[PDB]
C-alpha cells in the first residue's frame, strides 16, 4: 500500500538529504578553529558549524514536496522555528553512543558535553539534548524514516507565525501518511513496534529542547561581545 507517489516522496527526501549532508565533514575546515584550552572557547567554531548547518537545512527544506508552494513568509516562519530542531535531528547521524559525543571524524571535530558547555550552554539543555540523541539513536531509524521526520518537523502547522496553516497541515499530512505507511510496509518487527508514535514523541521532545534553547540563546546573544562572535545568518535566523 506504499503508493507510487509515496515512494517518489521518499526518493526525493533521500536525495535531498544526500545533497545536503556531507558525511566526510570536509567543509568543517573552513570554520573558525575550535579552542579547547576557555571562556566560550568553542563559540566561534560552533557558530560557524551551526551557521553551516542552517544553510544545509534550508537547502533540504526547499526540496520537500509542497514546501515551495508555501508563501515566502511561511517558508521563513517554518525555517526559523524548526532550524535548531532539524539541526538536533540531523546531528544524530554524527552522534555516537560509544561516548555520547558528536563525532565528525577528527578529534578536533569531535564535540562533547564540555565543548557544548564551552560554547555557552548549561546542563538544563545539554542533559536533555543528550537524552534525546540517545533515544533517537536507539530507535535505529531507517534513513527513509530519518529524512521523513526531518521534513515533517519542518512543515508543522502550529509553528508560531504561520499564515496558511491549512496548507502547511496538508503538506505535513502527506508526509505523515507516507511515514506511517513506510513503517507498516517496510519496517519489520520488533523495530516497528510503536515506531511512528515514538517518532512523533521525538517531535514533542524537540519543541521542548527548542523552548529551552531559545531562552539560553537569548541570554548568550544578549551581550554584544557574544553576538559579535556569531555569523550574520545565525543572527538573522536564531535572533538578532
Amino acid at each position: 500500500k506504499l503508493s507510487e507517489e509515496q515512494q517518489h516522496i521518499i526518493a526525493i527526501l533521500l536525495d535531498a538529504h544526500h545533497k545536503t549532508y556531507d558525511p566526510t565533514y570536509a567543509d568543517f575546515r573552513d570554520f573558525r578553529p575550535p579552542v579547547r584550552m576557555s571562556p566560550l572557547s568553542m563559540l566561534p567554531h560552533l557558530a560557524d558549524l551551526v551557521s553551516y548547518s542552517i544553510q544545509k537545512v534550508i537547502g533540504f527544506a526547499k526540496m520537500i514536496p509542497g514546501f515551495r508552494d508555501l508563501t515566502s513568509d511561511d517558508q521563513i516562519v517554518l525555517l526559523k522555528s524548526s532550524a535548531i530542531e532539524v539541526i538536533m535531528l540531523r546531528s544524530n547521524q554524527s552522534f555516537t553512543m560509544d561516548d555520547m559525543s558528536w563525532d565528525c571524524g577528527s578529534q578536533d571535530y569531535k564535540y562533547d558535553v564540555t565543548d557544548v558547555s564551552k560554547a555557552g550552554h548549561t546542563l538544563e539543555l545539554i542533559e536533555p539534548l543528550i537524552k534525546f540523541q540517545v533515544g533517537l539513536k536507539k530507535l535505529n531509524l531507517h534513513e527513509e524514516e530519518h529524512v521523513l521526520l526531518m521534513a515533517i518537523c519542518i512543515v508543522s502547522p502550529d509553528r508560531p507565525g504561520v499564515q496558511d496553516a491549512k496548507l502547511v497541515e496538508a503538506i505535513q499530512d502527506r508526509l505523515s501518511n507516507t511515514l506511517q505507511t513506510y513503517i507498516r510496509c517496510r519496517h519489520p518487527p520488533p523495530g516497528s513496534h510503536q515506531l511512528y508514535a515514538k517518532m512523533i514523541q521525538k517531535l514533542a521532545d524537540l519543541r521542548s529542547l527548542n523552548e529551552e534553547h531559545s531562552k539560553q540563546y537569548r541570554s548568550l546573544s544578549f551581550q554584544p561581545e557574544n553576538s559579535m562572535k556569531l555569523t550574520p545568518l545565525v543572527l538573522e535566523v536564531f535572533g538578532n
Partner: peptide, 11 residues
C-alpha cells in the same frame, strides 16, 4: 521581520 539572507537562500 526582514531576512535577506534566509530569503536569498530560499530563492
Amino acid at each position: 521581520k526582514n531576512h535577506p539572507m534566509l530569503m536569498n537562500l530560499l530563492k
